[PDB]
Amino acid sequence: EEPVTADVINPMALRQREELREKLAAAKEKRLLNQKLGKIPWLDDTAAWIERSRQLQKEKDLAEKRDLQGLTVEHAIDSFREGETMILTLKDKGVLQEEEDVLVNVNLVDKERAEKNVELRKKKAQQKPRSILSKPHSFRLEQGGT
């Protein structure tokens, strides 16, 4: 057929333009910083400074005379038995990852993994197997009460 010319993806050009944009941004920030940084008798007389120091010394002598919770947990409501209390900790996430800070219990994770593994052992929209597998019950907190 007749195609359409696409933009060429050149990693060298990408790095060069990234460096150029960084340099331009750094120059702009330097100008903006210098905009603020560029706004800053007794300076030479020793006897005048001595007198001023003495007068400041005597002046000093005369003067001396929980509601903060709105995050989510990676568990179901029924996973928590009413008659027991548990400790909920943070879930291990990469620092650079910017997902929601979910809250998690280690014992319930162990139980969920065991039952999931058990489910797999027992097992032994359209196209569910390739969607629910290759493509986590939770509830959010409100003022510390759910």
Partner 1 sequence: RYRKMKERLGLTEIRKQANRMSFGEIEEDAYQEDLGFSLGHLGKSGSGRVRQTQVNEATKARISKTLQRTLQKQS
Partner 2 sequence: TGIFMHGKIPTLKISLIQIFRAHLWQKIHESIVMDLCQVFDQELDALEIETVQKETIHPRKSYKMNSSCADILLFASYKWNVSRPSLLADSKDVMDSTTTQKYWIDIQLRWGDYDSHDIERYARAKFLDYTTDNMSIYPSPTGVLIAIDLAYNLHSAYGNWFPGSKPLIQQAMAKIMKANPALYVLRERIRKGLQLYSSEPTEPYLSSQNYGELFSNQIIWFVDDTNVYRVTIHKTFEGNLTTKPINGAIFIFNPRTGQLFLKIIHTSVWAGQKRLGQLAKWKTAEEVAALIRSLPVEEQPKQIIVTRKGMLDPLEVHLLDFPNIVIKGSELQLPFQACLKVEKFGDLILKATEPQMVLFNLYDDWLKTISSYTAFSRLILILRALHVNNDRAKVILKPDKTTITEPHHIWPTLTDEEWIKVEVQLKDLILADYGKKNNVNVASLTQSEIRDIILGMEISAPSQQRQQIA
Partner 3 sequence: NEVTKERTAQCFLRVDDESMQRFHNRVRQILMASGSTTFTKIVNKWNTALIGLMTYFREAVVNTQELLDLLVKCENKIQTRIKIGLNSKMPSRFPPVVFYTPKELGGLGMLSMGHVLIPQSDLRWSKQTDVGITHFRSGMSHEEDQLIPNLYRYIQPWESEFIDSQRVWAEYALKRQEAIAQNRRLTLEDLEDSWDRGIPRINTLFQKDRHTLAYDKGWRVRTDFKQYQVLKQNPFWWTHQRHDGKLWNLNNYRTDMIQALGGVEGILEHTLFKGTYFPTWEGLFWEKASGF
Considering the rule CB under 8 A, would residue 133 count as an interface residue with partner 3?
no
# chain residues binding partner 2, by CB under 8 A: 51
Considering the rule CB under 8 A, would residue 3 count as an interface residue with partner 3?
yes
Considering the rule CB under 8 A, would residue 31 count as an interface residue with partner 2?
no
Considering the rule CB under 8 A, would residue 12 count as an interface residue with partner 1?
yes
Considering the rule CB under 8 A, would residue 67 count as an interface residue with partner 2?
no
Residue type, position 140, single letter: R
C-alpha span between 59 and 39 (Å, rounded): 31
Where does this chain touch partner 2 (CB under 8 A) — which range of 4-12, 20-28, 50-58, 73-81? 73-81
Per-residue b/e over 13-25, b at no fewer than 16 CB within 10 Å?
Answer: eeeeeeeeeeeee
Residue 113: C-alpha distances to residues 101, 118, 119 (Å): 21, 8, 10
Where does this chain touch partner 3 (CB under 8 A) — which range of 12-20, 39-47, 62-70, 97-105? 12-20
Q: Which residues contact 143 (CB under 8 A, 6 or more apart)?
A: 67, 69, 70
Considering the rule CB under 8 A, would residue 11 count as an interface residue with partner 1?
yes
